[PDB]
């Protein structure tokens, strides 16, 4: 997360860490949707161009975390994956279209003050909230600045970062890049005229973009950090997987398995 701030304890009890067994590595962010399911970006598990094709046994899920590096004894919970599901139409080839996947835990996690699921949106929530200018929140242990040789300093945070960003109109998103945009994606970030900074970044993928509903006091997962061109660049916006639009696939998996 670039230009964010340290999260507060318990602020995002749904934040999950995709951790690789060997070598130890922070793979990506994720989200807790129930006591046995986690939602994440497909490219976190499958992305041929960089050689990723992970299986249920190469990973671990760590929930209730704050510190990126610390083994938080008696706070964090470590779970094993039973099975992973990738949307059958995910497109790694060209634009990360349909960048989403589900992971079924081997056993359910017990909820605590640090572990609690986020809500998946319904039509109503999706319509009232996913509007240009409304702000959402993004969290993760990803890079603090775009990788660049001229950078001096630490690019990794010690604790979970958070940043709030406004939703941007579809036609502004489309004009800012040359990647083909689809409706299974939405963009967020400040416009040049707002002269503000903030963004998700490498290592933030799979993390949730949530919104809080004035109608019921609850937090809804509206997007998944998917891709960008740089981090915090002028005139660019971050892209997120449109969760509501892929919700039918989500329910079918959970219902079947």
């Amino acid at each position: 997360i670039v230009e964010g701030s340290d999260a507060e304890i318990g602020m995002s009890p749904w934040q999950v860490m995709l951790f690789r067994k060997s070598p130890q590595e922070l793979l990506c962010g994720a989200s807790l949707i129930s006591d046995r399911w986690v939602l994440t970006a497909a490219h976190c598990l499958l992305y041929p161009p960089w050689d990723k094709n992970f299986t249920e046994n190469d990973l671990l899920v760590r929930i209730g975390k704050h510190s990126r590096t610390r083994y938080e004894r008696n706070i964090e919970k470590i779970s094993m994956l039973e099975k992973i599901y990738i949307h059958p139409r995910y497109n790694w080839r060209e634009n990360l279209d349909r960048d989403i996947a589900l992971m079924k835990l081997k056993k359910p996690v017990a909820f605590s003050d640090y572990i609690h699921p986020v809500c998946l949106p319904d039509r109503e929530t999706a319509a009232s909230l996913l509007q240009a200018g409304y702000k959402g929140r993004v969290t993760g242990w990803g890079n603090l600045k775009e990788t660049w040789t001229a950078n001096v300093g630490k690019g990794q945070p010690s604790v979970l970062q958070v940043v709030n960003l406004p939703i941007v109109e579809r036609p502004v998103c489309k004009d800012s890049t040359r990647i083909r945009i689809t409706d299974n994606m939405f963009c967020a970030g400040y416009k040049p005229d707002e002269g503000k900074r903030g963004d998700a970044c490498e290592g933030d993928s799979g993390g949730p973009f949530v919104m809080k509903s004035p109608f019921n006091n609850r937090w809804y997962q509206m997007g998944i950090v998917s891709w960008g061109e740089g981090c915090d660049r002028d005139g660019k916006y971050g892209f997120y997987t449109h969760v509501f639009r892929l919700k039918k696939w989500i329910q079918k998996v959970i219902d079947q398995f």
């Binding site: 318990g10 009890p13 605590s112 699921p117």
Partner: peptide, 26 residues
């Protein structure tokens, strides 16, 4: 049934440090 309500926030009637900016924008 209980999704989205944070134990240390919502369940206690507590607000996080930037929570309100989200609502201001709505």
């Amino acid at each position: 049934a209980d999704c989205g309500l944070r134990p240390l926030f919502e369940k206690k009637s507590l607000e996080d440090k930037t929570e309100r900016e989200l609502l201001e924008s709505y």
